[PDB]
């Protein structure tokens, strides 16, 4: 109905019933059994199975000890008492895991999305990539909501994207909430609030980086 999962330590002994008339199977997840040893003339037939598996058939009528050795230097012992009935499957498992595999993120992001990200990061760092060179900031590149005042600061441009940084100034003297979508102008690719602050108060001077398209079409 379901394999009997048994996590015994290395060199562990687990007493389990086996069937004397039907084949039984022992398998270790993530390991391939290499060898199986038992008292001579107890287990009549032993066969390797896809992956790591041992199908053994025993005609014996006496309890006996059987040793299984896997491919990663693991040895487990089992005390088997044959009994009339169905063949029994056993999922042998290690007690304390020896190592922890750090699975790398397999996920890869879209090329355009990466291009926007790298540039924004570089501008923030201040390092300017080889292709990019400095030019004049665009006079009006963003929507100004609620009395904000924008002063051009810096910009750099390159073959396919261009960047502008503007300093926001708040004259409202009210508690405002920023949503990057407000600063959208037909033709913008991304908006970054350098300081990740949700609400700007009066004189909230966050600087925002917007990358548009040089050679816009």
């Amino acid at each position: 109905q379901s394999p009997a999962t048994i996590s015994l330590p290395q060199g562990g002994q687990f007493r389990l019933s086996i069937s004397n008339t039907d084949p039984n199977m022992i398998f270790i997840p993530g390991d391939k059994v290499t060898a199986i040893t038992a008292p001579g003339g107890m287990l009549a037939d032993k066969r390797l199975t896809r992956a790591g598996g041992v199908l053994f058939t025993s005609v014996a009528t006496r309890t006996f000890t059987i040793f299984v050795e896997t491919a990663r230097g693991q040895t487990f012992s089992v005390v088997a008492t044959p009994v009339k009935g169905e063949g029994r499957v056993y999922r042998l498992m290690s007690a304390e895991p020896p190592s922890r595999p750090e699975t790398r993120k397999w996920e890869t992001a879209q090329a355009y999305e990466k291009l926007l990200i790298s540039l924004n990061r570089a501008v923030l760092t201040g390092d300017i990539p080889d292709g990019y060179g400095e030019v004049k900031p665009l006079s009006d590149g963003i929507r100004l909501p609620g009395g904000f005042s924008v002063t051009p600061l810096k910009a750099w441009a390159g073959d396919q994207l261009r960047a502008d940084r503007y300093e926001l100034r708040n004259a409202n003297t009210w508690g405002v909430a920023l949503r990057e979508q407000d600063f959208w102008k037909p033709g913008v690719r991304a908006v970054m609030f350098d300081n990740n602050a949700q609400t700007l108060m009066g004189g909230g001077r966050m600087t925002v980086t917007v990358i548009r398209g040089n050679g816009e079409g």
Partner: peptide
């Protein structure tokens, strides 16, 4: 560069 089709629409619970 990839196209940018939609101009921002006319300007729980996030607008």
């Amino acid at each position: 560069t990839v196209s940018t089709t939609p101009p921002v629409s006319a300007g729980v619970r996030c607008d």
